[PDB]
């Protein structure tokens, strides 16, 4: 059962990586590409949240 503790820590580092690898977007494209990069980021953050939630609940289920 020593593995399941390291597994959860490994799992959290991945979730942490996921978020860190989706950084807030740089303003360029005058409200058009700026709104596109904004929309894109929000979509991805929703996904990162739902994957985290699902990964994590296997460790507290």
């Amino acid at each position, epitope marked *: 059962s020593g593995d399941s503790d390291e597994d959860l820590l490994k799992a959290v580092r991945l979730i942490k990586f996921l978020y860190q690898s989706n950084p807030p977007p740089n303003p360029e494209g005058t409200r058009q590409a700026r709104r596109n990069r904004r929309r894109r980021w929000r979509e991805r953050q929703r996904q990162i949240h739902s994957i985290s939630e699902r990964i994590l609940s*296997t460790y507290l289920g």
Partner: single-chain antibody
Amino acid sequence: ELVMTQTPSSVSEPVGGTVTIKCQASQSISSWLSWYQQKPGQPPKLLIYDASNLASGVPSRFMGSGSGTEYTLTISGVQREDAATYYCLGGYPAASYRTAFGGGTELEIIQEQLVESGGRLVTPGTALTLTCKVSGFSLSGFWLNWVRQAPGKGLEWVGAIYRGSGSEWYASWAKGRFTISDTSTTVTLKLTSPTTEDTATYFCAADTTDNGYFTIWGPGTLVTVSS
């Protein structure tokens, strides 16, 4: 830890007849269930995703169902081109219970590129390195899985890597024995001390959505461990 109990072993059905393949998860996997069709000497092709969703190009005759823990693939108006071998894949690499394939059912009837190289005849003991070259992925980071298949046996999940980080995840049997590593346009699989029980075709599969299912597969590489 996760065990996909698949029934039946095999099914003989005439053209037009209804075909019902079932998977029973050992743990609550939820939407984490995908169905694959595999033809002789061919890598598996994705059919159904997130339990009920049909993959792009797949005909309507293939339906995916899921009631909590029990899962179902129905091929309704069966044709001669559906004579193949079907498997379910349940779970997630990063999940506590990992991701596992069902036994598989053999049915008889009456852009993104992945290439694995390095499959050779190693002598029992000899370290081996299988390398999966990755090209055309509009994706920076994603899961790159290693799936093996012993001659005339089912698909097994070796492990995966989240292409960005160093998040290596392996099956119970695989840990210690195997080592997945990341590079620029590549991902390797190292067999540290292989036995004859490691003779199989090794495939590298990509999860291009991060939802736990394999969309793109490689041709496969034949590994033989024999003196």
